[PDB]
Amino acid sequence: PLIVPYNLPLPGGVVPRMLITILGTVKPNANRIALDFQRGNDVAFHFNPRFNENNRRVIVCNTKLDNNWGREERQSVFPFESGKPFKIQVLVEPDHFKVAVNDAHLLQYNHRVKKLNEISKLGISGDIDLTSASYTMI
Numbered sequence: 001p002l003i004v005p006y007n008l009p010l011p012g013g014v015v016p017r018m019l020i021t022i023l024g025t026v027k028p029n030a031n032r033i034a035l036d037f038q039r040g041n042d043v044a045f046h047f048n049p050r051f052n053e054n055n056r057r058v059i060v061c062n063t064k065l066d067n068n069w070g071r072e073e074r075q076s077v078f079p080f081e082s083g084k085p086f087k088i089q090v091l092v093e094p095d096h097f098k099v100a101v102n103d104a105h106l107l108q109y110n111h112r113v114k115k116l117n118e119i120s121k122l123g124i125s126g127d128i129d130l131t132s133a134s135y136t137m138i
């Protein structure tokens with residue numbers, strides 16, 4: 001397995017038609033997972049499965065600008081399961097990141113950070129065994 005937290009450079013930033021694929025297995029009794037598409041210290045797109053937020057499972061998405069988190073976007077469809085292998089696909093579209101988990105569409109996140117070419121790393125952290133993280137153009 002790859003070492004978590006893992007940094008995946010995104011050379012030249014992201015662009016529409018770029019597909020990022022993350023394969024891993026959720027740890028037993030997981031609490032949290034995060035993907036962080038970063039523009040320097042800013043987080044353009046934070047994708048954060050929470051397994052126990054007041055006894056509910058929820059995906060929280062947000063952006064961090066100058067160390068401040070913005071308005072959260074929440075999704076109660078929750079396709080992750082402790083102990084189980086998953087696939088996350090993040091497709092960059094012109095106006096949003098489009099996320100599918102285990103081949104099922106999950107959510108879209110409209111671009112708040114609009115300098116897509118400056119979003120040039122992806123951090124992967126939290127309660128997973130990370131098998132692979134890669135990108136390709138579709």
Ligand SMILES: Cc1ccc(S[C@@H]2O[C@H](CO)[C@H](O)[C@H](n3cc(-c4c(F)c(F)c(F)c(F)c4F)nn3)[C@H]2O)cc1
Nearest residue numbers: 032033034046048060061062069070071072125126127
């Ligand atoms: C005013 C206010 C008060 C409380 C909060 S709570 C905050 O909410 C954010 C989304 O709006 C982020 O989720 C943020 N956050 C989570 C992580 C994280 C992770 F999600 C992992 F999965 C992980 F493995 C790890 F190491 C982490 F550090 N880092 N920052 C959270 O602290 C936010 C605003």
